[PDB]
């Protein structure tokens, strides 16, 4: 009789998408990303600074 | 505002109930409304719609047409269903022993079917003895044999009958209908 919006009313959000509990529990919305130490090639930085 | 791609509030264009006030026809329509709703048999839906038809949309079905249908191989023991009147035909000299379920039977048609050895059945008795229309054969009369259709679509070179009150010479058989008098149609 009445459209209840997800993104609110967590009861409805959990009626749909049973995975939203795991997303919230493991905090996938703040996934810290593994650090990588690659560096740009000297030709890329040279042409970026080039007039 | 909406860019309406089709006419709004457009009715179906079909009859949803008989135009008549016949109480008995209304009882038949209510019996076959229940059957069409509560059964999956497409025979029930066809009969329900055919009960709504106008007098010119249910032409009489001759007993000779019934007999001709019974000559179809495998259809000899079927029940003939006519949503409309079944009329007598003196051009047929033998009639098989069958069962016909029709709205109305002329006196000559009722006598001939019984004399052959069958029985004339009303549509309510058809539903009692065949709730889904088992081994039925729906017959329909010739809609285009009406003398009103001859004048439909009148125009040059269409080969249609003009609307006239008197026939014969001196009545539209002249200029416009022969090369000897101007042109031909």
């Amino acid at each position: 009789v009445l459209k209840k919006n997800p993104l609110k009313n967590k009861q409805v959000l959990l009626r749909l998408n049973p995975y939203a509990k795991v997303f919230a529990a493991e905090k996938l919305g703040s996934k810290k990303a593994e650090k990588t130490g690659t560096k740009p090639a000297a030709v890329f930085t040279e042409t970026l600074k080039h007039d | 505002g909406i860019d309406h791609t089709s006419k709004q509030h457009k009715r179906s264009g079909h009859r949803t109930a008989p135009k008549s006030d016949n109480v008995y026809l209304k009882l038949l329509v209510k019996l076959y409304t229940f059957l069409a709703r509560r059964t999956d048999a497409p025979f029930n839906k066809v009969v329900l719609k055919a009960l709504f038809l106008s007098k010119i949309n249910r032409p009489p079905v001759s007993v000779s047409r019934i007999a001709r249908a019974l000559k179809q191989e495998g259809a000899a023991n079927k029940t003939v269903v006519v949503v409309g009147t079944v009329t007598d035909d003196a051009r047929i000299f033998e009639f098989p022993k069958t069962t016909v379920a029709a709205l109305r039977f002329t006196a000559g048609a009722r006598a001939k079917i019984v004399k052959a050895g069958g029985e004339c059945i009303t549509l309510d008795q058809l539903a009692v003895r065949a709730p889904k229309g088992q081994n039925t054969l729906i017959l329909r009369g010739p809609r285009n044999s009406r003398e009103a259709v001859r004048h439909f679509g009148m125009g040059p070179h269409k080969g249609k009958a003009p609307r006239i009150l008197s026939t014969g010479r001196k009545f539209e058989r002249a200029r416009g209908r022969r090369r000897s008098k101007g042109f031909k149609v």
């Binding site: 459209k3 209840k4 919006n5 997800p6 993104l7 409805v12 749909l16 998408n17 995975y19 | -």
Partner: protein, 122 residues
């Protein structure tokens, strides 16, 4: 389809939606076309009854077939009722809507800025 968009430039604004925009759009304003009727999704069984023959059985299945253009994108999209978005909450950010996005207006392809527009428009 690129020729259709190039033919209706002055009347539409379009861009490339993100997963965030698509998920929020379907969850909040997503309706189904069931028996030619606008049925709110609101439930997983409604979607699986009309798209389960194509291997789609949940609202995230529908969202997946949209974000990545799968083999049954046409059937999933045609099942979706066109979204009825509201006027933007922060406004259009432009004095006059009917200029191209490059020329300072609002119609035309706006690349990835459609996400900012749509999320405010629903």
């Amino acid at each position: 389809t690129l020729e259709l968009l190039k033919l209706i430039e002055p009347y539409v604004a379009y861009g490339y939606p993100s997963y965030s925009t698509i998920r929020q759009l379907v969850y909040k304003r997503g309706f189904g076309k069931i028996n030619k009727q606008r049925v709110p999704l609101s439930d997983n069984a409604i979607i699986e009854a009309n798209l389960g023959k194509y291997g789609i059985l949940s609202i995230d299945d529908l969202i997946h077939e949209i974000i990545t253009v799968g083999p049954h994108f046409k059937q999933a999209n045609n099942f979706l009722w066109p979204f009825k978005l509201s006027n933007p909450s922060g406004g259009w950010g432009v004095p006059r809507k009917f200029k191209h996005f490059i020329q300072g207006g609002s119609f035309g392809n706006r690349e990835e800025f459609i996400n900012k527009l749509v999320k405010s428009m629903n």
